[PDB]
Design a protein around this ligand. Structure first.
Ligand SMILES: NS(=O)(=O)c1cnc2cccnn12
Ligand SMILES: NS(=O)(=O)c1cnc2cccnn12
Ligand SMILES: [Zn+2]
Length: 140
């Protein structure tokens, strides 16, 4: 689990979005596993605007933050998970690291702020859904 809280926006994995998230929907993309909903109180997180390929992610299944190198956001084939079938996911970054289904929502962060959230796992890789292209998160 986990979300990004930026302004009056809540960024979550689409597959973990709640009824309240859908009832307060701003934007969702199944191909990216992202959903954004509205908040009443303002959030504590800042979005990275950058092309960093190094950062740190939170892994709930180790209760540890790991420094990782990660690929730039691409269209990647993902094998079947407890929450998705084998399919192609867009705006996905991969790193070598531990990721189980419950680790989805963990933040990846660089020196500029929040890069993305854990979205995929298996075979010793962790995949993160990028949010740095979503400039509209910073306003309105
Ligand atoms: N490496 S860690 O201390 O962050 C850790 C590993 N396993 C647990 C269980 C509870 C709390 N912390 N914890
Ligand atoms: N990725 S994070 O910095 O927001 C984080 C730190 N500790 C937890 C526990 C659950 C979800 N997320 N989380
Ligand atoms: Zn950065």
């Amino acid at each position: 689990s986990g979300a990004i809280y930026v302004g009056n926006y809540r960024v979550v994995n689409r597959h973990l979005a709640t009824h309240n998230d859908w009832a307060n929907l701003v934007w969702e993309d199944s191909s990216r596993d992202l959903l954004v909903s509205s908040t009443t109180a303002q959030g504590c997180d800042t979005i990275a605007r950058c092309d960093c390929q190094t950062g740190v992610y939170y892994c709930s299944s180790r209760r540890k933050h790991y420094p990782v190198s990660f690929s730039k956001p691409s269209l990647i084939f993902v094998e079947a998970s407890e929450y998705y079938p084998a399919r192609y996911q867009s705006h996905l970054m991969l790193a070598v690291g531990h990721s189980e289904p419950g680790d989805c929502g963990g933040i990846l962060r660089c020196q500029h702020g929040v890069v993305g959230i854990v979205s995929t796992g298996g075979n010793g890789l962790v995949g993160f859904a990028d949010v740095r292209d979503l400039l509209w998160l910073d306003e309105e």
